[PDB]
Amino acid sequence: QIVLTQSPAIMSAFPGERVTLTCSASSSVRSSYLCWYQQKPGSSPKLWIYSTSKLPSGVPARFSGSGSGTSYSLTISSMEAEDAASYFCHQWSSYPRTFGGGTKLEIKRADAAPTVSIFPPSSEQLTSGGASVVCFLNNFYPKDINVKWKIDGSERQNGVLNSWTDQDSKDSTYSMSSTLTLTKDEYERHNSYTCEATHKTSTSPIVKSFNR
Amino acid sequence: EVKLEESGGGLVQPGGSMKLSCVASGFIFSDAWMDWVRQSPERGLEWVAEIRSKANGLAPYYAESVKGRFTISRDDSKSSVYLQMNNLRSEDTGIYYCTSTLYYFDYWGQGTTLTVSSAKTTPPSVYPLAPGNSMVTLGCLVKGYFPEPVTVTWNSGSLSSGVHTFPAVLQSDLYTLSSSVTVPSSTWPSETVTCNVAHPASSTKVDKKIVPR
Any residues with CB less than 8 A from the CB of B62 and at least 6 apart, and which? Predict the structure, then answer.
């Protein structure tokens, strides 16, 4: 089977910069049957380049492709925000048909502080017996960021689950959710709850809090 | 227009069987080659099976990991392609896409999720997230469901900007996610904000209204 290798797996580029993604094949691939798919979050992969270098309808003209034998490449003449997505190379020259591991192409932008929002356990959850405190850190850059919790001033760390979104398509920012799960008893024993966000390259954190 | 409607997904116990169906419309189905592709968090994006047009010999091809257990077939008179799966294993879990190829042009369906697990279908608990400035952020917490996925919209999709729906995380063998929406204060609570949470595997839908505390 023809194994397709896409290195590196993550790549970043400034707006307007020329970008090139590579696809290495273990054995020769006929150029007519080497294609590239683009996938954005929440959507199926779309054929983006066919027959090594040809563009289907709807694909912007700044995209191009080249290569032969075992080495192929996709090129963006000028990186744009809507080009941040996953890209897979694919061959159907020899069966089994195979895909590359994919490359997440992201676009650089200006640093942004996260909008932080904290939410207490709803009464519907308290009726059932649990208590989840939610904290959203929305629209920040870069992706590196830290979050911490405090209960009545005491620093918390256990029972915390985090989830990151992909880079947004319009403002190129990231978002994160931090959920602290506790029992109804433990939540009722305390009153003050605090979620704060800190970027290691900064001192002033963004703090939100509430009282039960 | 070109359309591939997929069905037959859901949860199945290991060793069970299931048939994925794909109904094509908007082209000459008998001229197209049909393919099934799988995308999973642990096996990446992998081709599953292919069946060619009648004029091309109608030959089927299979990936090695499914050869013998999967059978791809097509009914041209019903413009449909099927993937019948026996002895399903945990490795077969993922989003299956039905695709059609005419000339070099390839079209993919939206995909349906197949989950092979011994765990039972569990509907989610949907909890509102109301706060306790010029813009406010509301949310919905979807906790304790199985299997994937759940879909979250806001105000039946009319609230599309400023929406962040986060990937599901695994907690106590169940899935949990949250969705946030940011709106101007002039719109809420003067006008209602409701999250629509759909979990197809349990045939559940919750329309949770975010009332102020």
Answer: B48, B49, B70, B72
**Arch. (CATH architecture) of B119-203:** Sandwich (2.60)
For residue B202, give how far its alpha carbon lies from the nearest alpha carbon of chain A (Å). 20
Q: A210, B132: Cβ pair inside 8 Å?
A: yes
DSSP per position, B27-71: S-GGGSEEEEEEEETTTEEEEEEEE--GGGT--EEE-TTTBTTEE
Angle at A50 between CA A46 and CA A56, to 5 degrees: 65
**Are A141 and A173 in contact, with CB atoms under 8 Å apart?**
yes
A 173-212 near B (Cβ less than 8 A)? 175-177, 179, 181, 210-211
**Method used experimentally:** X-ray
Residue with tokens 């329309």: B207
**Domain assignments of chain B as residue spans, ordered by start:** 1-118, 119-203
Indicate the resolution in Å.
2.3
Q: How many residues does chain B have?
A: 213
Which class for B204: exposed (0-12), middle (13-18), buried (19 or more C-beta within 10 A)? middle
Total count of residues recorded for chain A = 212
The alpha-carbon gap from B116 to the nearest alpha carbon of chain A, in Å, equals 21
CB spacing of A176 vs B45 below 8 angstroms: no
Structural domains of chain A, with CATH: 4-107 (2.60.40.10), 115-211 (2.60.40.10)
Inter-chain residue contact A101 with B44, CB threshold 8 Å: yes
